[PDB]
Ligand binder design. Sequence first.
Ligand SMILES: *[C@@H]1O[C@H](CO)[C@@H](O[C@@H]2O[C@H](CO)[C@@H](O)[C@H](O)[C@H]2NC(C)=O)[C@H](O)[C@H]1NC(C)=O
Ligand SMILES: *[C@@H]1O[C@H](CO)[C@@H](O[C@@H]2O[C@H](CO)[C@@H](O)[C@H](O)[C@H]2NC(C)=O)[C@H](O)[C@H]1NC(C)=O
Ligand SMILES: *[C@@H]1O[C@H](CO)[C@@H](O[C@@H]2O[C@H](CO)[C@@H](O)[C@H](O)[C@H]2NC(C)=O)[C@H](O)[C@H]1NC(C)=O
Ligand SMILES: *[C@@H]1O[C@H](CO)[C@@H](O[C@@H]2O[C@H](CO)[C@@H](O)[C@H](O)[C@H]2NC(C)=O)[C@H](O)[C@H]1NC(C)=O
Ligand SMILES: *[C@@H]1O[C@H](CO)[C@@H](O[C@@H]2O[C@H](CO)[C@@H](O)[C@H](O)[C@H]2NC(C)=O)[C@H](O)[C@H]1NC(C)=O
Ligand SMILES: *[C@@H]1O[C@H](CO)[C@@H](O[C@@H]2O[C@H](CO)[C@@H](O)[C@H](O)[C@H]2NC(C)=O)[C@H](O)[C@H]1NC(C)=O
Ligand SMILES: *[C@@H]1O[C@H](CO)[C@@H](O)[C@H](O)[C@H]1NC(C)=O
Ligand SMILES: *[C@@H]1O[C@H](CO)[C@@H](O)[C@H](O)[C@H]1NC(C)=O
Ligand SMILES: *[C@@H]1O[C@H](CO)[C@@H](O)[C@H](O)[C@H]1NC(C)=O
Ligand SMILES: *[C@@H]1O[C@H](CO)[C@@H](O)[C@H](O)[C@H]1NC(C)=O
Ligand SMILES: *[C@@H]1O[C@H](CO)[C@@H](O)[C@H](O)[C@H]1NC(C)=O
Ligand SMILES: *[C@@H]1O[C@H](CO)[C@@H](O)[C@H](O)[C@H]1NC(C)=O
Ligand SMILES: *[C@@H]1O[C@H](CO)[C@@H](O)[C@H](O)[C@H]1NC(C)=O
Ligand SMILES: *[C@@H]1O[C@H](CO)[C@@H](O)[C@H](O)[C@H]1NC(C)=O
Ligand SMILES: *[C@@H]1O[C@H](CO)[C@@H](O)[C@H](O)[C@H]1NC(C)=O
Ligand SMILES: *[C@@H]1O[C@H](CO)[C@@H](O)[C@H](O)[C@H]1NC(C)=O
Ligand SMILES: *[C@@H]1O[C@H](CO)[C@@H](O)[C@H](O)[C@H]1NC(C)=O
Ligand SMILES: *[C@@H]1O[C@H](CO)[C@@H](O)[C@H](O)[C@H]1NC(C)=O
Ligand SMILES: *[C@@H]1O[C@H](CO)[C@@H](O)[C@H](O)[C@H]1NC(C)=O
Lengths: 31, 1017, 273, 50, 50
Amino acid sequence: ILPQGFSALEPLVDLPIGINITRFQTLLALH
Amino acid sequence: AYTNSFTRGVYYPDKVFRSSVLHSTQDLFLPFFSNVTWFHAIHDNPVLPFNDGVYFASTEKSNIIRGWIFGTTLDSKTQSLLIVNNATNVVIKVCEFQFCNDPFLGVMESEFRVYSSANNCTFEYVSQPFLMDLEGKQGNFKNLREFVFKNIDGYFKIYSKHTPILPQGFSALEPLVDLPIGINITRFQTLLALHGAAAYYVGYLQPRTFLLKYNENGTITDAVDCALDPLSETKCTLKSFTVEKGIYQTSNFRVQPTESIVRFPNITNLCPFGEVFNATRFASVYAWNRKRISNCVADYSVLYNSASFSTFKCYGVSPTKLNDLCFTNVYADSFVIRGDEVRQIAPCQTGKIADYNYKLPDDFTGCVIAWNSNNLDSKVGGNYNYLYRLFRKSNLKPFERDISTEIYQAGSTPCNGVEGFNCYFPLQSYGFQPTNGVGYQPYRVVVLSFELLHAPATVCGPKKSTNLVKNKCVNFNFNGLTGTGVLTESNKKFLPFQQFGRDIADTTDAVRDPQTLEILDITPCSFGGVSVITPGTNTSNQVAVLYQDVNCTEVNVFQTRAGCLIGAEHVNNSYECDIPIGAGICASYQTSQSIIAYTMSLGAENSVAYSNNSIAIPTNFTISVTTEILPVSMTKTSVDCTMYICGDSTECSNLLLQYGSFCTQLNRALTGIAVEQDKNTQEVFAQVKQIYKTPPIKDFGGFNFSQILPDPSKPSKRSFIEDLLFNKVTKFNGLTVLPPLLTDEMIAQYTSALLAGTITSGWTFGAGAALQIPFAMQMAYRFNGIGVTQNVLYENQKLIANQFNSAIGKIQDSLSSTASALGKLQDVVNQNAQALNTLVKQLSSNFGAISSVLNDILSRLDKCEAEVQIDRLITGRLQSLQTYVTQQLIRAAEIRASANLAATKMSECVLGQSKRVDFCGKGYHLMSFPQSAPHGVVFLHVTYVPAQEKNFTTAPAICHDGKAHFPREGVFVSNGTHWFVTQRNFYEPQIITTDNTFVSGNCDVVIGIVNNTVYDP
Amino acid sequence: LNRALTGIAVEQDKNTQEVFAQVKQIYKTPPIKDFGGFNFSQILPDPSKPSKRSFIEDLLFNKVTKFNGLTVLPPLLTDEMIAQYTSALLAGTITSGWTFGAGAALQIPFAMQMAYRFNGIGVTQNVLYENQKLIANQFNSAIGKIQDSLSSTASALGKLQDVVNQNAQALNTLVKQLSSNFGAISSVLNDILSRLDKCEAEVQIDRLITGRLQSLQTYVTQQLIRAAEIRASANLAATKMSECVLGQSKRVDFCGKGYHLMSFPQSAPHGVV
Amino acid sequence: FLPFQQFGRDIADTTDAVRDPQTLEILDITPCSFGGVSVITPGTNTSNQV
Amino acid sequence: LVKQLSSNFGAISSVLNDILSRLDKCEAEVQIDRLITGRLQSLQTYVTQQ
Ligand SMILES: *[C@@H]1O[C@H](CO)[C@@H](O[C@@H]2O[C@H](CO)[C@@H](O)[C@H](O)[C@H]2NC(C)=O)[C@H](O)[C@H]1NC(C)=O
Ligand SMILES: *[C@@H]1O[C@H](CO)[C@@H](O[C@@H]2O[C@H](CO)[C@@H](O)[C@H](O)[C@H]2NC(C)=O)[C@H](O)[C@H]1NC(C)=O
Ligand SMILES: *[C@@H]1O[C@H](CO)[C@@H](O[C@@H]2O[C@H](CO)[C@@H](O)[C@H](O)[C@H]2NC(C)=O)[C@H](O)[C@H]1NC(C)=O
Ligand SMILES: *[C@@H]1O[C@H](CO)[C@@H](O[C@@H]2O[C@H](CO)[C@@H](O)[C@H](O)[C@H]2NC(C)=O)[C@H](O)[C@H]1NC(C)=O
Ligand SMILES: *[C@@H]1O[C@H](CO)[C@@H](O[C@@H]2O[C@H](CO)[C@@H](O)[C@H](O)[C@H]2NC(C)=O)[C@H](O)[C@H]1NC(C)=O
Ligand SMILES: *[C@@H]1O[C@H](CO)[C@@H](O[C@@H]2O[C@H](CO)[C@@H](O)[C@H](O)[C@H]2NC(C)=O)[C@H](O)[C@H]1NC(C)=O
Ligand SMILES: *[C@@H]1O[C@H](CO)[C@@H](O)[C@H](O)[C@H]1NC(C)=O
Ligand SMILES: *[C@@H]1O[C@H](CO)[C@@H](O)[C@H](O)[C@H]1NC(C)=O
Ligand SMILES: *[C@@H]1O[C@H](CO)[C@@H](O)[C@H](O)[C@H]1NC(C)=O
Ligand SMILES: *[C@@H]1O[C@H](CO)[C@@H](O)[C@H](O)[C@H]1NC(C)=O
Ligand SMILES: *[C@@H]1O[C@H](CO)[C@@H](O)[C@H](O)[C@H]1NC(C)=O
Ligand SMILES: *[C@@H]1O[C@H](CO)[C@@H](O)[C@H](O)[C@H]1NC(C)=O
Ligand SMILES: *[C@@H]1O[C@H](CO)[C@@H](O)[C@H](O)[C@H]1NC(C)=O
Ligand SMILES: *[C@@H]1O[C@H](CO)[C@@H](O)[C@H](O)[C@H]1NC(C)=O
Ligand SMILES: *[C@@H]1O[C@H](CO)[C@@H](O)[C@H](O)[C@H]1NC(C)=O
Ligand SMILES: *[C@@H]1O[C@H](CO)[C@@H](O)[C@H](O)[C@H]1NC(C)=O
Ligand SMILES: *[C@@H]1O[C@H](CO)[C@@H](O)[C@H](O)[C@H]1NC(C)=O
Ligand SMILES: *[C@@H]1O[C@H](CO)[C@@H](O)[C@H](O)[C@H]1NC(C)=O
Ligand SMILES: *[C@@H]1O[C@H](CO)[C@@H](O)[C@H](O)[C@H]1NC(C)=O
């Protein structure tokens, strides 16, 4: 390069984690 | 030496009596006209292979041929069947026989050396005595003794036929004893006696379909080998031994693969199953382990053949196919459970294991492997290292794990650190002791979860790969995905995670080769329908074959766009179409004689001598009579859906009630049809309010109607022609035919009334009352109605009557000669009979049931298990009826349209005179006459056809005194010296006067105006 | 089912034969087109084409637009043969009026043919001759508008295109049905066989058949009904050909709006104009 | 029936005739007479006689 | 067409909600496909007749 346009997302690894996920967080780095 | 098997090797397929019926069966028979090896023996006999069954025959004069030997090695290492017929007592033994280098029985007999030992013998049978030839005696052969020997699932079936006398002829072989020998037979030998010439014949069976024709006495008298040649294939396809001229679709050509192609990823490392199945420690079921198996060669036959497993259930897959199939990944979910809980590790189970500790998807593909444990997983004082989840607030989703030591508040008491009432731990542990019962001892269970292929495969079975061959039809297997087709290079670009391509039908369009990452298109190898082009079998049995939409290279020989036609010679000359091929090509049987193929002619080439001042005016005419045949009705069938589906069975009827109103709505539809058949008949014939009669004296101006009016001397007052029509057109399963409301006599009376009205009153009986008129005057009006002045009839009345009478005579001669005249009504009859015959035969179908006979199910199964087989038969008999009824409704609609057309013609052709071109026959319509016919009506259309013409010069108008004179009716013509005005459809020149022409304008506007004079009376 | 579809294919050729092949001979126009000012160059064959079709026919053909055991059989009468039949019908109509229908083709000047057609509608024939030049120009202009209309928008042939679309649509539906599971583990028959031994497999396969047969029965039933509709249309077309082109129709709005004079057939893909 | 044949069949695969197991004679099996029953009635506003 | 909804077609009940409220999904799948196998035929019959 939200930008305007179209793009399909390809698959990456399929991980058999088996965990019940209800929460999320992203990770940012600190200077 | 070899000979041609001249119509031999057919046996009675079963033990059911049949008569006057053609029955189709597929089993191992010797094909007609095959080559058979012929051996003769003067005064020795080779060992032959036993493929899938052998046909044997012999001609005898001294009974040299005695018996047969069957087995695999015939040397005492395996069991071997020995059959000997030594002119007196048939002896059958199954022993581990030691055979001699040259087996024989002496001929007075002085030897017995067919075998040398008996050991570990399992079967012996000896028949009663008889007498046969025993001495050496020469001459000509008197007894042909034919046999068939085959082994199906351990039953050794012997068929035979004895007849007085390869000879030409036909003879079916009846069954003899059925012996449960259970031996794998790969080899054969015959047995000859040693001292006299004694020939015998050996043939071989291949899987064939045969059509057997049973005669009136129930003996098979002929047969068609449905896989012999195109004519036999056509005969078998139509279930008849006679084929009419035309083109039939009998089969489908399919190119077969030449070699198999097996392609797999080139990995040779073996998969770590031992570290899973023989692991030191299994995880607990609340915290089961999941090892991913990838990048290896797996072998599930070792795990499968091993007897150590207690239970083995595969869902979606079968254990013997796992060796060929391969996967993107395999997961081994490993844990220990209690024995009685093994049942819960399965799709669609619930319980303390299935909901809380290990849930499988209900759409699960893979295998559940389990075995008991009592060495490792159990101790004295119990094994308390195994924990399971005993309480959870909600169940588990498929393959979710959830480790948690949070003490479970069963109620509303928030204990939050201390166990109590309604506050327990979710993890519980049961112990395992060697003294516990079967259901409470530990079992080690591993479930193998398979992801079936959608991505590059990494876990494949021990099946070895092969080399790849391009541009040939092959039977391929790419990573477990199988199919047949030609592999070619392609220019498609699969992106790296995509392995397979698909077509609209979800079939594979292209694949990426697992060894070399290139894209290969998969196009199934060329195929197409095969049509047989044949003259009727009463002329010739020679045929031509059309291979549809192929070039013939893939298959004297002529390539057309309909396909490549073989056996028909291409002829440059065009003719009228006979047997259509397609794409403009027709074939026929012509001249010694052979089948020809040609481009269809569209008619003779003609040009019209057009000019701006030339008109052709007819000078003579012909009265023609043509026959138009229309269906009016079809047989009023009625089907009792209950007796058909559930004949005389309460159990079935009660099951049928679970399908609701399907019966009464089918009975309703058929009733509606039967009613419309009577309405159709009523609309076509009953439009006349009174029954009219002709006078006893037939003074109709020379027109002879004696062949269309009723003849009082018959038991049914039909016309002569009607009798001819009736002589040309030709129930205990709940299927009936209702009679029509209007009998043939009543129809004849209606047509008689219509004819008498037409003859004596013209069109007046249609509009209102029948007003008598002389027939000649009626014709005068009909001629006037077509633009021919009435005087033409009167001046030529005698000629016209003779032409009419002659035309009628030709109709009788035509109708009296060939059967094909009534084909439109006969096809309707044939279609209805055919629909019913199909419907009746469908009762013989199983539809997946154990038997087509409903009573045989009920007499063998108790009601509850029986319910499945019976609903399955209903599920098929109902479809057969729905198909039949739907086809009848569509066909009835076609008949209704035809009947409506017939009624329209009756109204406009017979009752009036039609100005609609070619509606009431070709030519200018005069009159029509109805005649009845079986399930239809025949109209005799009387038409005026111009016969002879001359070239006359014309002009659109004539100038006189500067005025332009135009015809009132007719055209101006000139014979080269004088101008006349005449009627268009009959040359009759008249002097041009002011009373035949009219004046409008001035002769300076009109294109083509000519000079003349007009006489003024 | 093979029988029902064969019956349909046969009726498609009979329908074509009934509409176009009612003339016993192949007629031809003279090389000199002296038809009283009526210009037929746009409906008569032009010898310079690889297929002897009229200009308008080419316009019609430019507007109307297999490995699962599904095939299409060719018609018996090729487009060229249809064009020859329509050419013969046009040449007959132009040079002999209605006489070629009843019997032999009797030549007549075109202007006289029109004189009869005008007389047939209650207009005295002198009206044509006095106004013959005007009439020819209006005819020629009307023909030009037909080409311009046909040459401009795609929608002119919608009745034939819908038939084509319906048949393609029926086949596309039929092909897609092979992708359906019908309760089976997989829509791909080979994938069932390569994974299950015969006996357990028998259930999945009968289940797929139980659905592929229904798809065919539905298709065939719809084709029989649609074929009946086409047959009715073909019968109507044959009736018009007989009463509109070969004769002159007194039936109101049967052969177009207005008082009918003449009609001209032109071939089109899977139909007649 | 020829000696190994015990049963006969119709087109519908129903039995047409059987050979009696005690006396080896052939007996035809024709299902006993049956047929539809139709009710002929004036409308019920006139009469309930049928 | 409306009455055909009351038919069982071999199922335990003609009422779809009564199957779902009584059987878990997996065993239920058989009874439901069985009801569909019949409601579809009823519609196909209706549509064909129409
Ligand atoms: C029946 O017996 C024959 C022996 O005549 C078996 O054929 C042998 O099969 C093995 C395995 O493929 C080959 O290595 C041998 O060479 C074959 N023998 C001959 C003479 O060719 C046959 O497999 C047996 N069939 C069954 C089902 O047991
Ligand atoms: C019109 O045609 C009819 C036959 O269609 C002619 O009648 C024939 O005349 C010849 C004389 O040359 C006789 O030999 C035949 O026997 C007649 N046949 C019949 C059936 O009558 C008639 O003469 C023709 N008229 C004209 C004027 O040409
Ligand atoms: C109407 O035609 C029939 C023939 O279809 C005539 O009957 C024939 O008459 C002749 C006498 O001229 C007999 O020799 C034939 O045997 C009769 N045939 C039949 C079948 O009856 C009948 O005479 C004709 N009508 C008139 C008034 O002449
Ligand atoms: C055109 O028709 C007229 C009228 O019949 C013919 O004139 C007659 O010819 C015959 C002999 O040729 C004479 O005997 C008559 O007297 C003529 N009629 C009159 C009124 O003069 C004329 O010949 C015909 N022309 C041709 C070329 O056939
Ligand atoms: C028909 O006759 C008329 C009158 O006799 C002709 O009219 C004459 O035509 C010539 C040549 O075109 C003119 O020069 C005269 O002036 C015309 N006279 C009149 C009174 O109109 C006419 O041409 C003739 N037509 C034919 C075909 O012969
Ligand atoms: C019939 O109409 C065509 C047009 O559709 C005429 O052909 C045109 O003739 C003119 C000359 O006047 C040329 O300039 C055009 O280029 C031609 N167009 C085509 C498409 O050929 C034809 O000449 C007309 N016929 C007559 C006898 O005039
Ligand atoms: C046996 O068949 C072969 C090939 O079909 C043929 O060439 C040979 O002549 C046949 N034997 C006899 C005796 O005709
Ligand atoms: C044929 O073999 C049987 C086998 O037991 C024997 O009893 C019989 O005598 C033999 N027939 C001869 C030697 O003619
Ligand atoms: C078969 O023959 C052998 C000969 O040595 C004998 O030992 C054996 O007991 C016999 N029976 C079986 C069943 O093998
Ligand atoms: C066989 O058919 C013939 C027909 O001519 C008949 O006479 C005969 O009685 C039938 N039965 C037998 C056993 O021949
Ligand atoms: C082994 O796999 C590689 C991968 O592309 C391939 O190139 C090579 O030819 C294979 N070897 C054999 C012997 O098939
Ligand atoms: C487990 O051990 C036994 C005995 O050592 C062996 O026969 C078996 O093959 C092993 N399991 C696997 C998967 O190899
Ligand atoms: C067979 O057909 C030919 C010609 O169609 C006919 O002449 C002959 O009589 C027919 N034979 C039979 C037995 O139908
Ligand atoms: C028939 O085969 C030839 C030979 O390869 C090929 O050139 C031709 O295009 C094929 N198809 C035809 C003639 O329609
Ligand atoms: C038929 O015509 C073709 C023209 O392409 C010619 O090649 C062929 O030899 C002709 N056949 C005969 C038998 O005259
Ligand atoms: C009319 O004249 C043309 C040309 O002179 C000729 O070909 C045609 O056969 C003639 N017609 C008759 C019926 O004589
Ligand atoms: C048409 O008629 C005109 C006179 O009206 C004449 O000059 C012309 O030559 C005629 N046509 C032919 C082809 O002769
Ligand atoms: C016993 O069977 C024979 C065989 O035909 C039969 O004739 C006899 O009547 C039977 N006896 C009884 C008592 O049924
Ligand atoms: C019943 O039918 C009769 C005759 O058709 C009519 O007169 C009468 O009014 C009808 N009654 C009712 C209640 O419809």
